[PDB]
Amino acid sequence: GVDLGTENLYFQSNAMLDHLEQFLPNKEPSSIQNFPFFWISQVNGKYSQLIEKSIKKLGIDNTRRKIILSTNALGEASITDIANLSTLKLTTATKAVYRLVEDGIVEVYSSTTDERISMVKLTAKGVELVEQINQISVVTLAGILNAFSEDELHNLNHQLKKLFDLMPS
Amino acid sequence: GVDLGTENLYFQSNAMLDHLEQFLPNKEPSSIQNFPFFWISQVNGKYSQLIEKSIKKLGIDNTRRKIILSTNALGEASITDIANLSTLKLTTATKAVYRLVEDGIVEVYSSTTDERISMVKLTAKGVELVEQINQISVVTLAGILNAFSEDELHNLNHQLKKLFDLMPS
Ligand SMILES: O=C(O)Cc1c[nH]c2ccccc12
Ligand SMILES: O=C(O)Cc1c[nH]c2ccccc12
Ligand code: NI
Ligand code: NI
C-alpha cells in the first residue's frame, strides 16, 4: 500500500511487482547481482577505498578532495552547495572546509549577495593542489575509464542521473 | 607515472589523458556531471537516505537489512561473505549479526567444514522479516525501477559490474 502523495492508499499492479521481482534480492543465490543498487553500492565502496588509498600521498582525504574539486568547478560556492555536490552532511563539509582554510587551501568569505552564506574559493595553493589531485586521478583512473567507450560512459551517466532524479527527499 | 605491476614507471599516452579529461571534474561548472563516480556516489547517497528512512518502521537499519537479504539469498553464509556482499567492514558486520542474534533474526553457528568460520542463517522470525523487507521494498522502489525497461536495467548492472571488476584492492 503506497499513497503517491494523496490521502488514499494504493496497491500496485501484480505487473509492477513481477517486474520489480526480476531485480530484487530473494531466496536465489544470484538475485543480489540483478539489483542495480547493489552494484551502485559495491562500485561506490570499491572506488572509495581506491581513491582514499591513493589520495593519501597529498595528505588529504577524499572528503577534502571533493570539496576542492567542487570549489574548482564552481569557482565560488555555497558551503551548502559544495556539501551537496560532494555527497556530504553540511556539518562534515563545514568541518573539512575550515580544516582546508587552516591549511591555506581555500578562502572562506561572507557572501556579497547575503552575508550569512559562507562562500568558498581556492587559494593559489588550492589551485596547485587541484593539478596534483588531477594527476593522481590520471594515474589511478586512466586505465579503468579508458576501458569504456565515450558512448558507454555518457549513457551510464544518463541512467544514473535518471535514477537520482526519480528518488525524492 | 604508473607502474602497471612492474619495477618501471610509465607515462600514459596523451590520448588516454584527453579521453579521461572528457570525464574529470575540472574548472568548468558542468565537468562534475560528466564523472561516472560522481553519479554513483550521488545515487548511492540518495538511495541510502531513502532506504534507511523507510526501513525505519521494521525497527532495523539498512546495515541489518543487507545482512538479512544476503543470508536469505545464500541460505547459509560466512559472516565474511555477508559483510562483502553487504559492502560492510567485517567488524561492522559481526557487530550487527550478533545484534540480530540477540533479536532472534539469525542463528550463528560454527561452520561444519571449518569451526572458525561463523555461518549465519535466518530463523523463522528472520524469514517473516524478509517478506516484510520485500514489501517495504515494493512500496518505496516499484515506481523508480518500473520507470526503466528490463534492457536498460540489465545493461546498467553489466556496466556497473565491468567497473567493479577493473578496480583492484
Ligand atoms: O543497500 C542496498 O540496497 C544495496 C545492497 C548492497 N549490498 C546488498 C546486499 C543485499 C541486498 C542489497 C544490497
Ligand atoms: O568521490 C568521487 O570521486 C565522486 C564525487 C562525488 N562528489 C564529487 C564532487 C566532486 C568530484 C568528485 C565527486
Ligand atoms: Ni548501500
Ligand atoms: Ni564518494
Residue numbers in the entry:
A (entry chain A), B (entry chain A): -14 to 154
Mind quoting what the paper says about this structure?
We characterize the binding of IAA to MarR-family regulators from both iac and iad loci. Most characterized MarR-family regulators function as repressors by binding to an operator sequence upstream of the genes they control. When a relevant ligand binds the MarR repressor, it releases from DNA, allowing gene expression. The structures of MarRs from representatives of each auxin degradation operon type establish that each has distinct IAA-binding pockets.
